[PDB]
RNA sequence: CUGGGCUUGUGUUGGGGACCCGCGGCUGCUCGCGGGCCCUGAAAAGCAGUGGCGGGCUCG
């Protein structure tokens, strides 16, 4: 027996989603960012239950379906459109290189040929694709910590890291380093 | 109605012994190195009955399971005589939780802060419409039977 | 636009309102709280621009200030409220130890935005606030927030909408409150109170307050001329291409036209 | 077996038709539902009329949801007897109520280029209307010409 | 009863009282320091400092394994970050006193052998790679041996650090460690055959080469200058391979 | 319509608490003689255990 | 135009009234759009009206 309050909370919380999405589409698909390019790590955040179709397909585009997983992404003009659309269900900010270091070493898993198997060996990274300058684990970090000409290909090999659930614990400048630190 | 009552009343919970001592240590420290009247939830049977009799209460909540029931039998009718809206509530344990005791037979609100005078008057209207109107022609009738 | 015929209308409409007010009312009743001079005064006449296009095809809901050579609301009974986007106690201390003597008198109540949403969310309270003051200011950091806070009771009518006031420097509240130097604040408050106000609505008629019916007409004529020239050059698009009739009319009388 | 019409008012903002249909469909079978809106701006008048399949489920839903403090609104759900039930009471049930932007419509309805023959009618309606205003300010002692 | 009282203010409802009881709990998930004081237990368990080095055979090798391990519910990431801190503290002692002599590698990983006060200590470090914990294993048991070897190595490296006289604990920088310095994030101020091997040598590590074991071995034998790639780490010798100061560059490429 | 008691209301209902004031000064003497540590804000508690 | 401002940033509960207007239409009364002056517990008892793109449900 769903109570009436839950119904009213839904509609007020869907109209605010409609209002904000109109404001994004009104101004432009742009964000007030300096011209220097950076990299953003995005983490799924538990949020609004019912997802509108346009934030839903952007989670699908960012392979963000299941909760709490996370992917890497650079900045384009197009990325800031996806950033501020899916923002109430994600947390974003520029990570640090050592934060990537745990994410490929301790948190690293593998995706090749459409089936998800764990990382097995460095030669398995060669076996996966291993071709576009891919010789070890630091290939992914080189495409991540530095902006990569084949980082889109590096993301194509990449799978959303299923991050760990913490126990009791706007762009973050470097405060996202604290995000994985409780979520590693 | 019980849930909406405790939404307002939990905002007016009395201070615990831990945080009362902390505030006393705060003010004593500042003297070594400005406030208004505190609005809390009024409790205590002898205190609340006096607040009823001086018309100082605005809403009254009465536990339905006081095991000498003589302590609360006159209390709905006394609130009716002076005009104060009352509501019989489930749980003498629930009211004691609200007021940091094991038990509480009666709970009264007297005056609330200015940020929530509207939702108290809305809660009072929800008692004289949702509770005291249905009780009206069934509070004078004998219970049970067979 | 011509000034002399504007003046001779301004004589005629203003002289009419004295004849209308001084005429007795036929059910044999008087008014305790309405002197003949007090109702000859306190009755504003206002300029009604008529356009061709619907100007600013949206609801602007934020007034624009036209600096008037001689101010509008500088009487002795004006209660004014300053809605501020920062700790209320900093502005409360600012208006108490400073803000001359006239501004100290007119400051009725300064209220934080956070304290406004807690104490004035209901529609009793935003109606009690409407009837208690006369002019409402607002910091420019909360001009957008006031439609939700002070709703239809403050924004259905254009008589009392919050006036945009800049009160910034060029965040933890107790540590820092980014404000101007205090003399630059009180000087700017003076400008905002006595300024004629434009209100852009998807409409053809715009009513701009020009003064009350106890001023002397040449004072009014200099004031309406500045309202005319400021509004066309700055606010209405297609400056003189979209211009149309310009009436002046009191709250209980007919419309006196000027054409452009 | 006749349908029963229930009048619900003091509707919170958010408790519109699809949420109104969804909640009361958990009680029984909802046949026709229509909230009372405004043709000028699409906006509820905080008042809706519903009609169920069975009269038993109409009395059950109204009696259990009569005074229910929902988002600051103590509701009022009453049963309209079949003696009254106005025949044209569900003229727009189970239909979207679109928000027609008349002010944007009429604002640029003025702006479109117009016929030259109509522009003659524009002048005639103008000169009739200016002439009568010249009459109605001549007892005010005013003459203006254009 | 303390976890019974943390169900107290949670049950009746008191967020402030639930907090002040749980700061008083001092739970290991936010501290890294252990829940219970193991001072008197190790007082009765191990009799002499030589047996601490004998127990250092087991104490080090799991913590090098645990520091590479990811986090579970039983072992918080702050416990691993304290494991990675404490595993680095024993490494910084070894590279100062040059006590590392023998090293072996196998399928299990990397074995190091070091003599401290005439006592040989052997520990196994697997490679920098996430290990499958597939099967029936107990993390609750495993989290205790973390707490065991946290306090023991913390006690062992405290005794030896005053023995060498350098001030303890060593000072650490947060964000410069967050840039990926790993071993080189920390400053050591000496007052509060091994050396002759690569006494004056210049080293560079490339992109494939294992950064952590190579730097640990080189600094243990007194290699003054070790550089590596900007993506392997930072706060090192100049990354550019065109700089002719480098004598030997470590490369494992086909 | 009117309250039952016509007794006057004491002035202690309109002024700050006497008993709280006497308890404050007892803590002041403890801080003066150093028996009780002074108040530490939660920010200082964040720089603690 | 270095120093003071400017310009975008669209976000309003609903009813009623024994009142003054401006602009649109129609053979027309009158009805729309926008103001002004009052009343109102976040109050409430048909009077729902304007043409369309797409998609869905259907008939061949």
Curated annotation (Swiss-Prot), chain F:
It comes from Chaetomium thermophilum (strain DSM 1495 / CBS 144.50 / IMI 039719) (Thermochaetoides thermophila). It comes from the Eukaryota. Component of the NOP7 complex, which is required for maturation of the 25S and 5.8S ribosomal RNAs and formation of the 60S ribosome. Disulfide bonds: none annotated. It is found in: Nucleus, Nucleolus; Nucleus, Nucleoplasm. This is Ribosome biogenesis protein ERB1. Component of the NOP7 complex, composed of ERB1, NOP7 and YTM1. The complex is held together by ERB1, which interacts with NOP7 via its N-terminal domain and with YTM1 via a high-affinity interaction between the seven-bladed beta-propeller domains of the 2 proteins. The NOP7 complex associates with the 66S pre-ribosome. Belongs to the WD repeat BOP1/ERB1 family.
């Amino acid at each position: 027996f769903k109570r009436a309050e839950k119904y009213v909370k839904e509609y007020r919380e869907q109209e605010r989603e409609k209002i904000r999405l109109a404001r994004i589409a009104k101004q432009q698909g742009s964000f007030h960012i300096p011209a220097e390019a950076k990299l953003v790590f995005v983490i799924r955040i538990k949020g609004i239950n019912k997802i509108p179709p346009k934030p839903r397909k952007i989670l699908q585009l960012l392979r963000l379906r299941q909760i709490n997983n996370g992917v890497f992404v650079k900045v384009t003009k197009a990325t800031a459109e996806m950033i501020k659309i899916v923002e109430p269900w994600v947390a974003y900010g520029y990570p640090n290189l050592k934060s990537v270091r745990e994410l490929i070493y301790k948190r690293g898993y593998g995706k090749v040929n459409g089936q998800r198997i764990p990382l097995t060996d460095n030669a398995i990274i060669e076996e996966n694709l291993g071709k576009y300058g891919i010789i070890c684990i630091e290939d992914l970090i080189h495409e991540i910590f530095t902006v990569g000409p084949n980082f889109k290909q590096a993301a194509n090999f990449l799978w959303p890291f299923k991050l760990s659930n913490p126990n009791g614990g706007g762009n973050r400048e470097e405060h996202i380093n604290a995000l994985i630190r409780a979520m590693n | 109605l019980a849930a909406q009552a405790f939404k307002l009343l939990n905002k007016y919970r009395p201070e615990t012994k831990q945080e009362k001592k902390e505030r006393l240590l705060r003010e004593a420290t500042a003297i070594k190195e400005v406030s208004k009247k505190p609005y809390t939830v009024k409790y205590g049977l002898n205190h609340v009955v006096g607040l009823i009799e001086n018309k100082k209460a605005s809403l009254v909540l009465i536990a339905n399971d006081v095991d000498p029931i003589e302590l609360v039998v006159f209390l709905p009718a006394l609130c009716r005589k002076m005009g104060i809206p009352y509501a019989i509530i489930k749980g003498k344990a629930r009211l004691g939780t609200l007021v940091h005791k094991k038990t509480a037979a009666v709970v009264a609100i007297t005056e609330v802060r200015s940020e929530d005078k509207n939702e108290l008057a809305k809660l009072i209207s929800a008692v004289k419409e949702g509770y005291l109107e249905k009780v009206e022609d069934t509070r004078k009738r004998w219970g049970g039977g067979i | 636009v011509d000034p002399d015929q504007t003046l001779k209308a301004c004589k005629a409409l203003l002289a009419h309102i004295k004849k209308a007010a001084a005429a007795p009312r036929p059910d044999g009743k008087q008014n305790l709280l309405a002197d003949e001079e007090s109702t000859v005064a306190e009755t504003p006449i206002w300029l009604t621009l008529t356009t061709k296009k619907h100007i600013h095809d949206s609801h602007r809901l934020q007034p624009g200030k036209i600096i008037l050579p001689h101010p509008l609301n500088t009487s002795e009974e004006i209660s004014v409220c300053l809605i501020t986007a920062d700790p209320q106690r900093f502005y409360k201390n600012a208006v108490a130890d400073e803000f001359p003597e006239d501004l100290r008198a007119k400051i009725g109540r300064v209220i934080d935005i956070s304290h406004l949403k807690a104490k004035f969310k209901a529609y009793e309270a935003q109606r009690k606030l409407f009837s208690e003051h006369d002019v409402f200011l607002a910091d420019t950091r909360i001009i957008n927030r006031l439609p939700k806070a002070l709703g239809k009771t403050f924004y259905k009518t254009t008589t009392k909408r919050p006036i945009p006031v800049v009160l910034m420097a060029q965040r933890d509240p107790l540590e820092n409150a980014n404000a101007r130097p205090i003399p630059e604040i009180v000087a700017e408050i003076r400008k905002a109170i006595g300024a004629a106000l434009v209100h852009l609505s998807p409409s053809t008629n715009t009513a701009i307050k020009v003064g009350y019916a106890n001023w002397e007409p040449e004072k009014l004529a200099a004031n309406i001329e500045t309202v005319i020239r400021e509004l066309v050059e700055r606010f209405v698009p297609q400056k003189w291409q979209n211009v149309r009739n310009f009436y002046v009319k009191g709250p209980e009388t007919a419309a006196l036209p000027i054409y452009q | 077996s006749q349908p029963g019409v229930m009048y619900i008012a003091r509707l919170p903002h958010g408790f519109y038709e699809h949420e109104l249909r969804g909640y009361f469909s958990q009680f029984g079978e909802i046949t026709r539902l229509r909230v009372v809106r405004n043709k000028k701006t699409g906006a509820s008048r905080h008042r809706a009329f519903i009609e169920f399949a069975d009269a038993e489920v109409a009395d059950i839903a109204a009696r259990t949801m009569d005074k229910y403090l929902l988002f600051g609104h103590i509701l009022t759900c009453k049963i309209v007897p079949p003696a009254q039930v106005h025949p044209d009471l569900f003229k727009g049930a189970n239909r979207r109520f679109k928000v027609v932007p008349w002010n944007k419509m009429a604002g640029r309805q003025l702006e479109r280029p117009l016929s030259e023959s109509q522009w003659q009618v524009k002048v005639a309606k103008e000169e009739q209307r200016r002439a009568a205003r010249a009459e109605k300010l001549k007892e005010m002692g005013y003459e203006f010409e254009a | 009863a303390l976890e019974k009282k943390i169900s107290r203010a949670l049950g009746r409802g008191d967020v402030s009282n639930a907090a002040r009881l749980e700061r008083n709990a001092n739970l290991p998930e936010k501290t890294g320091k252990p829940r219970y004081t193991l001072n008197h237990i190790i007082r009765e368990r191990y009799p002499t400092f030589q047996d601490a080095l004998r127990d250092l055979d087991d104490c080090l090798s799991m913590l090098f394994l645990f520091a590479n391990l990811p986090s579970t519910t039983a072992v918080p990431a702050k416990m691993i970050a304290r494991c990675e801190r404490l595993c680095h503290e024993f490494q910084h002692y070894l590279i100062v006193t040059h006590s590392l002599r023998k090293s072996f590698l196998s399928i299990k990983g990397i074995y190091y052998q070091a003599n401290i006060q005439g006592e040989d200590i052997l520990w196994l470090v697997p490679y920098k790679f996430n290990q499958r914990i597939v099967g029936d294993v107990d993390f609750r048991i495993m989290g205790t041996f973390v707490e065991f070897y946290m306090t023991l190595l913390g006690f062992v490296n405290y005794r030896l650090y005053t023995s060498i006289g350098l001030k303890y604990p060593p000072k650490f920088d947060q964000v410069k460690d967050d840039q990926g310095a790993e071993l080189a994030a920390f400053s050591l101020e000496g007052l509060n055959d091994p050396s002759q091997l690569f006494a004056n040598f210049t080293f560079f590590l490339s992109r494939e080469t294992p950064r952590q074991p190579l730097e640990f071995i080189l600094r243990a034998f007194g290699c003054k200058r070790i550089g590596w790639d900007a993506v392997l780490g930072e706060g090192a010798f100049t990354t550019d391979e065109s700089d002719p100061r480098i004598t030997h560059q470590i490369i494992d490429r086909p | 319509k009117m309250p039952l008691s016509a007794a006057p209301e004491p002035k202690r209902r309109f002024i700050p608490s006497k008993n709280e004031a006497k308890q404050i000064m007892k803590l002041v003497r403890a801080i003066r003689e150093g028996r009780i540590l002074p108040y530490k804000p939660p920010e200082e508690r964040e720089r603690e255990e």
